[PDB]
Write a protein that binds this ligand. Structure first.
Ligand SMILES: [Mg+2]
Ligand SMILES: [Mg+2]
Ligand SMILES: [Mg+2]
Ligand SMILES: [Mg+2]
Ligand SMILES: [Mg+2]
Ligand SMILES: [Mg+2]
Ligand SMILES: [Mg+2]
Ligand SMILES: [Mg+2]
Ligand SMILES: [Mg+2]
Ligand SMILES: [Mg+2]
Ligand SMILES: [Mg+2]
Ligand SMILES: [Mg+2]
Ligand SMILES: [Mg+2]
Ligand SMILES: [Mg+2]
Ligand SMILES: [Mg+2]
Lengths: 53, 78, 107, 57, 96
RNA sequence: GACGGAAGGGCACCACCAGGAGUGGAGCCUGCGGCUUAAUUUGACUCAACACGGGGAAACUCACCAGGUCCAGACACAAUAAGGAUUGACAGAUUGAGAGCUCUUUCUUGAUUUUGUGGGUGGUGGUGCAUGGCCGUUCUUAGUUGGUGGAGUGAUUUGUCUGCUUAAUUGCGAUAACGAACGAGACCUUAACCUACUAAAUAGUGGUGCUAGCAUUUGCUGGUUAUCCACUUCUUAGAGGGACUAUCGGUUUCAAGCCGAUGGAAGUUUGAGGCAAUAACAGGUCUGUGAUGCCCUUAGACGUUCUGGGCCGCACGCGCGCUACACUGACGGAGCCAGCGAGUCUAACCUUGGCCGAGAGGUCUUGGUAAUCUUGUGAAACUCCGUCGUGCUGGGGAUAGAGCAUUGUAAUUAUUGCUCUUCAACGAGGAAUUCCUAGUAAGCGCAAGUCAUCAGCUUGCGUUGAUUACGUCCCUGCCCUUUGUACACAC
């Protein structure tokens, strides 16, 4: 009863979102974080990412 | 499950980060000072440190099994 | 089971290097007291996971960049062990936060 | 957007006391959802046989 | 949209048999895990409960952690018409 | 306190001197303004806007435009209803459409709802001049504060300084100050060394239990680690060791220091970063946030979804860039050497090898969840041997045409790759202006980020590797002292 309400999302910006805030922009999909670069900065420490050099 | 160690440790950190923000959103009154994860074989134990144990353990075994089932239901854990 | 070798390989990996060193020293320690033939703890190059991100949430300001480092240290030991001796030392007293893999090779 | 749905009784059945035995023609079919359906101009609407349905009435 | 009665029933008994319900915050998924219905109907129906009560809702990264409050245990007991005070459903059941 | 077209003293290749590479001129890329548009979505405009929002946008992204659906309008109240609230609908009209959106039409699940009142919810709506957090800048400079004591009615001042020194409010000293605290430093990460310990079939070496091929009386090379033995020099990573300007000489008030020579892996704070005080800015961000105050909107929606377009539009101006103007070169062949990475069973990620194809690429397979395999990423600049021969030329590749492929549901406004073909400006760049002191500048590529595909961009890495100076306050900026002030929203 609902077919026209959908369009393909197999790739690109709309195929993914931040796992914290669903921000389509600024994502870090490196290493499978799937966190945007801005939520990652607040939460880099508890994951295990630390600044040394 | 044959997942690379770099991606697995990253997912372990995201797992810890998920537990960290989850616990402080409900156990805010308990004086949530953090949490620890110990992955023993077939039994990963979540060591919740809270300054008010009388309510995180709840009464008669409540308020902790619900959180125990919530983490099980999300993370697809037996 | 009657004193038959298994040719086990124990591989240790975690970010917290310091307590992994203790267990790597622990695993090698319980071998000579049981007269166990072994190949020593082989240390593998550290994989420095790196993320290069802007400090700013917006676009304004000087273009300053941070590098985050999630270091991971992997080690492995080859032990010529009995079936009994390995099980009651590796299924018990497992250190926190360190991942361990027990695999079998029969070349 | 919706029709009145006037105070109708059962349809496609002639009468129960039509001098004087019960009269309900068009013997039972394989569709109970038996029952008839929406018939407008020499056409049929699927009501139960969702996958395969072969008849032209 | 409109939640069918068996969907409403299967959502309520699932929440009764262990207390908590988790639902991903993504509409138009139509394949909920561990419950055979659309994910939208799970969130919408639980929102209908939570406004009246019976459920304490927390979000925690778009994941919708739901928990059955003690006031709401007796309501779903009335909805499902289970025998009264024979099982808490299921917080204190086995270890005792 | 601020400012001064006031004086004096310091510091800094975001200042200068001596220079190097340039940019500004050219052609294309990209962003901004303007213009135009249905829309060409917005924020930011000296450093502190302008390859910036990780902003390399075909759909999504999306916030803009032209339109079509849905309510994901919770909950309460009153109506409506079980003489049926409403929903789904085949066909055709209508629609871009194979949206029952609406219409000709009437069957089906059945207080799951509809109408209205409230009241919630959503909003990349507005306000960053209501905010949090983060970031940028003053300032990566060296500065800030108090206890007790001294001065002053007081606001305040001294300490916190004339001098010398340092990268440093770093210290030596002076001394109505004395003893302190933060900052700086110390600290941490990383690079450089370790023939010393621990060891290693995921690293390497040598003999050989097993040996083999070529050429000759042993050099190069290919396999087995119950089809072997031994080891850690090179690689790795743990514990550590090591540098503290060590020794000597000179200079300094013979003090902190500085300079030279020797030795050493390292004598520029040993190189480079991480963190970084007080007080602030009406700096930026509400367009990251399920962070949020207030206001606006909320069913013909500023919610969300779908179709297509736009952000890329082109009389023009400006900034960051890429390729060049050639011989220190273009092209052909040959020689051929790195390092930092990443990578799939939660199914197509890295892709080897075989075949086909000019090429792009297609295909059959193998390995790797990774010091194992891609990958010795056999990278480019470079080196040699040749063709060219100062000719806008075989420099240069802009524009434009035809075709062959890949990615994507979709390539038109050409995603990109390849083949042939046109061979435009440009003959070293005006006024002006950027960065930089040793493995540094510059050249040269490679990896990763974004990513289905596309880098001319960024973050790092390695290859080749200069000139010049070890200084000064001339300009610019900052700080301090003295001074003047009718300034304090602070010239
Ligand atoms: Mg300048
Ligand atoms: Mg100059
Ligand atoms: Mg130029
Ligand atoms: Mg130019
Ligand atoms: Mg594009
Ligand atoms: Mg769009
Ligand atoms: Mg501000
Ligand atoms: Mg003072
Ligand atoms: Mg000091
Ligand atoms: Mg644009
Ligand atoms: Mg190599
Ligand atoms: Mg040419
Ligand atoms: Mg020509
Ligand atoms: Mg970019
Ligand atoms: Mg005067």
């Amino acid at each position: 009863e609902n077919v026209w309400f959908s369009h393909p999302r197999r790739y690109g910006k709309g195929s993914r979102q931040c796992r914290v805030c669903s921000s389509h922009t600024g994502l870090i999909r490196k290493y499978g974080l799937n966190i945007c670069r801005q939520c990652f900065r607040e939460k880099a420490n508890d994951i295990g990412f630390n600044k040394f050099r | 499950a044959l997942i690379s160690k770099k991606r697995k440790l990253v997912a372990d950190g995201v797992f810890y980060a998920e537990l960290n923000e989850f616990f402080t959103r409900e156990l805010a009154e308990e004086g949530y000072s953090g949490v620890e994860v110990r992955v023993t074989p077939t039994k990963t134990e979540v060591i919740i440190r809270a300054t008010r144990t009388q309510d995180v353990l709840g009464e008669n075994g409540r308020r902790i099994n619900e959180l125990t089932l919530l983490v099980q239901k999300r993370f697809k854990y037996a | 089971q009657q004193q038959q070798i298994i040719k086990i390989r124990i591989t240790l990996t975690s970010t917290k290097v310091k307590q992994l060193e203790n267990v790597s020293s622990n695993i090698v320690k319980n071998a000579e007291q049981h007269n166990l033939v072994k190949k020593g703890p082989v240390r593998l190059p550290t994989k420095v996971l790196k993320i290069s991100t802007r400090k700013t949430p917006n676009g304004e300001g000087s273009k300053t960049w941070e590098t985050y480092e999630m270091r991971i240290h992997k080690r492995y030991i080859d032990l010529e062990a009995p079936v009994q001796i390995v099980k009651r030392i590796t299924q018990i007293t497992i250190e926190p936060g360190v991942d361990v893999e027990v695999v079998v090779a029969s070349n | 957007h919706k029709h009145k749905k006037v105070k109708l009784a059962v349809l496609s059945y002639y009468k129960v006391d039509a001098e004087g035995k019960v009269t309900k023609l068009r013997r039972e079919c394989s569709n109970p959802t038996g029952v008839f359906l929406a018939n407008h101009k020499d056409r049929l609407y699927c009501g139960k046989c969702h996958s395969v349905y072969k008849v032209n009435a | 949209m409109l939640m069918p009665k068996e969907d409403r029933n299967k959502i309520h008994q699932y929440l009764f048999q262990e207390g908590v319900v988790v639902a991903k915050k993504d509409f138009n998924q139509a394949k909920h895990e561990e419950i055979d219905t659309k994910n939208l109907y799970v969130i919408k129906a639980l929102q209908s409960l939570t406004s009246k009560g019976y459920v304490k809702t927390q979000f925690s990264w778009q994941y919708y952690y739901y928990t059955l409050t003690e006031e709401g245990v007796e309501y779903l007991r009335e909805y499902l018409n289970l025998p009264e005070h024979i099982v808490p459903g299921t917080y204190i059941q086995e270890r005792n």
